[PDB]
Design a protein around this ligand. Structure first.
Ligand SMILES: [Mg+2]
Ligand SMILES: [Mg+2]
Ligand SMILES: [Mg+2]
Ligand SMILES: [Mg+2]
Ligand SMILES: [Mg+2]
Ligand SMILES: [Mg+2]
Ligand SMILES: [Mg+2]
Ligand SMILES: [Mg+2]
Ligand SMILES: [Mg+2]
Ligand SMILES: [Mg+2]
Ligand SMILES: [Mg+2]
Ligand SMILES: [Mg+2]
Ligand SMILES: [Mg+2]
Ligand SMILES: [Mg+2]
Ligand SMILES: [Mg+2]
Ligand SMILES: [Mg+2]
Ligand SMILES: [Mg+2]
Ligand SMILES: [Mg+2]
Ligand SMILES: [Mg+2]
Ligand SMILES: [Mg+2]
Ligand SMILES: [Mg+2]
Ligand SMILES: [Mg+2]
Ligand SMILES: [Mg+2]
Ligand SMILES: [Mg+2]
Ligand SMILES: [Mg+2]
Ligand SMILES: [Mg+2]
Ligand SMILES: [Mg+2]
Ligand SMILES: [Mg+2]
Ligand SMILES: [Mg+2]
Ligand SMILES: [Mg+2]
Ligand SMILES: [Mg+2]
Ligand SMILES: [Mg+2]
Ligand SMILES: [Mg+2]
Ligand SMILES: [Mg+2]
Ligand SMILES: [Mg+2]
Ligand SMILES: [Mg+2]
Ligand SMILES: [Mg+2]
Ligand SMILES: [Mg+2]
Ligand SMILES: [Mg+2]
Ligand SMILES: [Mg+2]
Ligand SMILES: [Mg+2]
Ligand SMILES: [Mg+2]
Ligand SMILES: [Mg+2]
Ligand SMILES: [Mg+2]
Ligand SMILES: [Mg+2]
Ligand SMILES: [Mg+2]
Ligand SMILES: [Mg+2]
Ligand SMILES: [Mg+2]
Ligand SMILES: [Mg+2]
Ligand SMILES: [Mg+2]
Ligand SMILES: [Mg+2]
Ligand SMILES: [Mg+2]
Ligand SMILES: [Mg+2]
Ligand SMILES: [Mg+2]
Ligand SMILES: [Mg+2]
Ligand SMILES: [Mg+2]
Ligand SMILES: [Mg+2]
Ligand SMILES: [Mg+2]
Ligand SMILES: [Mg+2]
Ligand SMILES: [Mg+2]
Ligand SMILES: [Mg+2]
Ligand SMILES: [Mg+2]
Ligand SMILES: [Mg+2]
Ligand SMILES: [Mg+2]
Ligand SMILES: [Mg+2]
Ligand SMILES: [Mg+2]
Ligand SMILES: [Mg+2]
Ligand SMILES: [Mg+2]
Ligand SMILES: [Mg+2]
Ligand SMILES: [Mg+2]
Ligand SMILES: [Mg+2]
Ligand SMILES: [Mg+2]
Ligand SMILES: [Mg+2]
Ligand SMILES: [Mg+2]
Ligand SMILES: [Mg+2]
Ligand SMILES: [Mg+2]
Ligand SMILES: [Mg+2]
Ligand SMILES: [Mg+2]
Ligand SMILES: [Mg+2]
Ligand SMILES: [Mg+2]
Ligand SMILES: [Mg+2]
Ligand SMILES: [Mg+2]
Ligand SMILES: [Mg+2]
Lengths: 136, 92, 116, 56, 75
RNA sequence: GUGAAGAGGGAAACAACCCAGACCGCCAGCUAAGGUCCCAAAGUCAUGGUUAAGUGGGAAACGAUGUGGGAAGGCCCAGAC
RNA sequence: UCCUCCUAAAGAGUAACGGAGGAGCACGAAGGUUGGCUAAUCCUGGUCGGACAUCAGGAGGUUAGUGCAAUGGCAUAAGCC
RNA sequence: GCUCAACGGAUAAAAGGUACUCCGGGGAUAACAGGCUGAUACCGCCCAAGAGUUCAUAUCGACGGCGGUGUUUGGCACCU
RNA sequence: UGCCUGGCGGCCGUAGCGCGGUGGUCCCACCUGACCCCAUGCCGAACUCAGAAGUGAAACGCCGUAGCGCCGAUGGUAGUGUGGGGUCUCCCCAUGCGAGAGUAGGGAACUGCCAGGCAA
């Protein structure tokens, strides 16, 4: 499960996931899964979607993960009142704006890429789409 | 590879949106010792034109006010998630 | 490099002295020759300047790089300074340790009449 | 050189600046056809509260 | 909780801005380190407080090698 | 900003939402928000379209020769589907 | 109780049993002023001596240092003699 | 000359019990119930790595996702 | 008047780096010694003094180069003041403002006050 190997601070502010994405161009691989919808992906969802792709495309091909969590989400325990401290860190999320390339794929047919990316797309909460590396 | 395009008169955020929501999109031509030229053109042509790999390499002749200006597509702005162009920079 | 080390050695005196708004007497020493110049409080224009490089002073003395030669400049600056109407000045030693030639220039500048 | 301004909306659920600007134009109530000398200032004041005034 | 402490705020900043006429002694900038520097007719106290040495208008300048912000006064 | 400390019209009813600030009277007219087939004041008003679910008149991932617009891309008189 | 940063929405100010750290001193030189100086960390060579003690040159240039937490600041050096 | 550090310092000098209790008040503040919410709970559904002699979807369903309900555990303290 | 040097500024990277050349007539640099003035917490290395055999090596100045750093439009994009609107965690519209990054390109500075030397 993906997680930052040591951080500056343990507990981060909530913030607001706003604006458009930056990692929009398909940089490394041939194909890729772009996020249409806005949201935030947990460390478990990314790993769950990666396994769905990696198992669909077999040993062959090459996969990237453009997203990484680096935002610790706090969760307050059950049967606990308000206040008396910020809650403990449970899981890590990557905030996803619209137009964010999540995964990229290379060394496979354009058919099998889409069929593999659907299985991953089904794991994720965000609404996604297939994209190809357009040259400039 | 013969794009046809009108000259822009209103330019900014407000005009560009009204334009972009009318099956067109703004672009610009520039290069050499001459001044730059702001250029309004149709979306559905240039969307179909970019599918070919020659578009981002070969020379294009843009028709403006009768005059055909020879240019190459230097830079381009994709719409974040929807498959559509926002803007193109034509180097001379 | 020595030059750049000597420039930063002086800078404090210069930056302190330009703040006060005083007429500074800059002195540049060299193995051969010694220079001197009274500069206006704005810091750009020169009012009086003299050196051993000048033939007016060089023709008299034997060598142009010692105490007795520096003295002769020290007189020549201060003698002119009084003709222009300068009197109250400051002494910018300019990163050169106040001991030999510059001291002989300064003492000769005091003994001539220039007030500092 | 004058211009006839007319207040066409209420000054209730508005900003203190917008309540002030109307006091600077001289508009007291809705439907008050006040006339002011045209300068770059008064046009600034009209442009500030354009939503609730009308020019003649 | 472990934490929950904070110091009282120090009221530091540019008190008199550029163009404001100030009296001989008036504080121009309260700050910690020399973020601005003391130019013409402006002092710099032990607290690095930039104060007016003479009567006149405050003038902010951008000068020197480091490109540093200086504060000057002009009569 | 509004209520508190502000009534009046609208949002069915609804301190704070939208409109607007009640000095008093009149069986006068023009407008705001919001409306105009009947309860209930005022368009079964005019032009060109869309919806066939009573959608309008609660809701997601995801599902499907539902149905309209477009802009393209695969084949013909050697007669493809 | 006092100090530092964020929260604090580009002047100041601004809460919560919000998020992280410190202080209850130290110093007759660690003050004054004058006159000087330049760092980290590597590279290569060199007795014991090795990754690292001390030396030489070269590389980098403030990653250093600042009596003490953090902030802002300092080569004119507030740094070290 | 004061960890008067409860640090604008009530005295120089001060800890507990009450189910034997009592008065003044509060729904400004809890316990029952109602309300608002739905993390949790229960009930669905979406994708399909595997099991099932072979064969994902008879019966199942990992790794993940999205809803409903107000039956649980809670949060808030709006009524009393 | 131009060509070159030296000191003192303004301007602070279009002004700074690396690489390629070049100058010693005077100037500047190293250089030549150390009763002395002074000096090293050892050392004339530094600072200092007394000099004129040498050289332009190093350092410094000047000219040429885009390898970098640096500057940088136009257009678009994000953001946002005000009045609205929505399918309201997020957007959108009218109107005003309008980045950053990136792109074309620009680009090895630019000036003042005295002094000295050479062609006048
Ligand atoms: Mg925040
Ligand atoms: Mg972001
Ligand atoms: Mg309990
Ligand atoms: Mg504009
Ligand atoms: Mg706008
Ligand atoms: Mg020397
Ligand atoms: Mg009021
Ligand atoms: Mg606790
Ligand atoms: Mg408190
Ligand atoms: Mg505070
Ligand atoms: Mg603070
Ligand atoms: Mg603060
Ligand atoms: Mg003082
Ligand atoms: Mg409002
Ligand atoms: Mg009311
Ligand atoms: Mg009402
Ligand atoms: Mg009503
Ligand atoms: Mg309604
Ligand atoms: Mg309504
Ligand atoms: Mg209602
Ligand atoms: Mg209704
Ligand atoms: Mg009613
Ligand atoms: Mg209501
Ligand atoms: Mg009234
Ligand atoms: Mg009417
Ligand atoms: Mg209406
Ligand atoms: Mg009614
Ligand atoms: Mg009726
Ligand atoms: Mg509707
Ligand atoms: Mg579907
Ligand atoms: Mg269909
Ligand atoms: Mg207090
Ligand atoms: Mg702040
Ligand atoms: Mg603010
Ligand atoms: Mg502030
Ligand atoms: Mg408060
Ligand atoms: Mg607090
Ligand atoms: Mg503490
Ligand atoms: Mg100290
Ligand atoms: Mg010193
Ligand atoms: Mg440091
Ligand atoms: Mg520190
Ligand atoms: Mg000091
Ligand atoms: Mg000191
Ligand atoms: Mg006592
Ligand atoms: Mg106490
Ligand atoms: Mg107390
Ligand atoms: Mg007590
Ligand atoms: Mg107290
Ligand atoms: Mg007390
Ligand atoms: Mg007491
Ligand atoms: Mg009892
Ligand atoms: Mg009793
Ligand atoms: Mg009793
Ligand atoms: Mg009782
Ligand atoms: Mg209550
Ligand atoms: Mg209370
Ligand atoms: Mg209970
Ligand atoms: Mg209860
Ligand atoms: Mg509910
Ligand atoms: Mg099943
Ligand atoms: Mg089971
Ligand atoms: Mg299970
Ligand atoms: Mg409350
Ligand atoms: Mg009741
Ligand atoms: Mg270098
Ligand atoms: Mg020597
Ligand atoms: Mg050379
Ligand atoms: Mg140079
Ligand atoms: Mg030349
Ligand atoms: Mg040149
Ligand atoms: Mg720039
Ligand atoms: Mg720019
Ligand atoms: Mg622009
Ligand atoms: Mg608004
Ligand atoms: Mg709004
Ligand atoms: Mg409307
Ligand atoms: Mg609808
Ligand atoms: Mg809203
Ligand atoms: Mg970008
Ligand atoms: Mg050039
Ligand atoms: Mg350059
Ligand atoms: Mg150069």
């Amino acid at each position: 499960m993906l997680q930052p190997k040591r951080t500056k601070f343990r507990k981060m502010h909530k913030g607001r996931n706003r604006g458009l994405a930056q990692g929009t161009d398909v940089s490394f691989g041939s194909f890729g899964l772009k996020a249409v919808g806005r949201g935030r992906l947990t460390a478990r969802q990314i790993e769950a979607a990666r396994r769905a792709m990696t198992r669909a495309v077999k040993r062959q091909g090459k996969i990237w993960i453009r997203v990484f969590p680096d935002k610790p989400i706090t969760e307050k325990p059950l049967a606990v009142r308000m206040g008396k401290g910020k809650g403990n860190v449970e899981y890590w999320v990557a905030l996803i704006q619209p137009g964010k390339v999540l995964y990229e794929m290379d060394g496979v047919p354009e058919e099998l890429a889409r069929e593999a990316f659907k299985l991953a797309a089904a794991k994720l909460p965000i609404k996604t789409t297939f994209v190809t590396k357009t040259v400039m | 590879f013969t794009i046809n395009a009108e000259v822009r008169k209103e330019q900014g955020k407000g005009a560009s949106r009204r334009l972009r929501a009318a099956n067109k999109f703004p672009a610009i031509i520039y290069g050499g010792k001459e001044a730059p030229l702001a250029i309004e053109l149709d979306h559905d042509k240039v969307m179909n034109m970019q599918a070919k790999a020659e578009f981002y390499s070969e020379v294009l002749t843009i028709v403006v006010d009768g005059k055909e200006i020879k240019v190459k597509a230097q830079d381009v702005q994709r719409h974040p998630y929807k498959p559509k162009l926002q803007h193109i920079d034509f180097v001379r | 490099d020595k030059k750049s080390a000597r420039i930063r050695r002086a800078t404090r005196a210069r930056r302190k002295l330009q703040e006060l708004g005083a007429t500074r007497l800059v002195v540049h020493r060299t193995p051969r020759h010694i220079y001197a110049q009274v500069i206006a409080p704005n810091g750009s224009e020169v009012l009086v300047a003299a050196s051993t490089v000048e033939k007016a002073i060089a023709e008299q003395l034997k060598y142009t790089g010692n105490k007795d030669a520096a003295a002769a400049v020290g007189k020549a600056v201060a003698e002119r300074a009084l003709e222009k109407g300068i009197k109250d000045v400051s002494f910018d030693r300019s990163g050169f340790q106040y001991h030999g030639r510059v001291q002989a220039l300064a003492d000769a500048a005091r003994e001539a009449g220039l007030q500092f | 050189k004058t211009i006839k301004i007319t207040q066409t909306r209420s000054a209730i659920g508005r900003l203190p600046k917008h309540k002030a600007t109307l006091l600077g134009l001289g508009l007291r109530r809705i439907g008050h056809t006040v006339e002011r000398e045209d300068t770059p200032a008064i046009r600034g004041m009209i442009n500030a509260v354009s939503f609730m005034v009308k020019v003649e | 909780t472990r934490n929950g402490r904070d110091s009282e705020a120090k009221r530091l900043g540019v008190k008199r801005f550029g163009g404001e006429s100030v009296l001989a002694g008036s504080i121009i900038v309260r700050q910690r380190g020399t973020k601005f520097h003391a130019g013409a007719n402006v002092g710099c106290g032990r607290d690095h407080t930039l104060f007016a040495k003479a009567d006149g208008k405050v003038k902010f300048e951008v000068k020197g090698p480091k490109n540093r912000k200086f504060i000057s006064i002009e009569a």
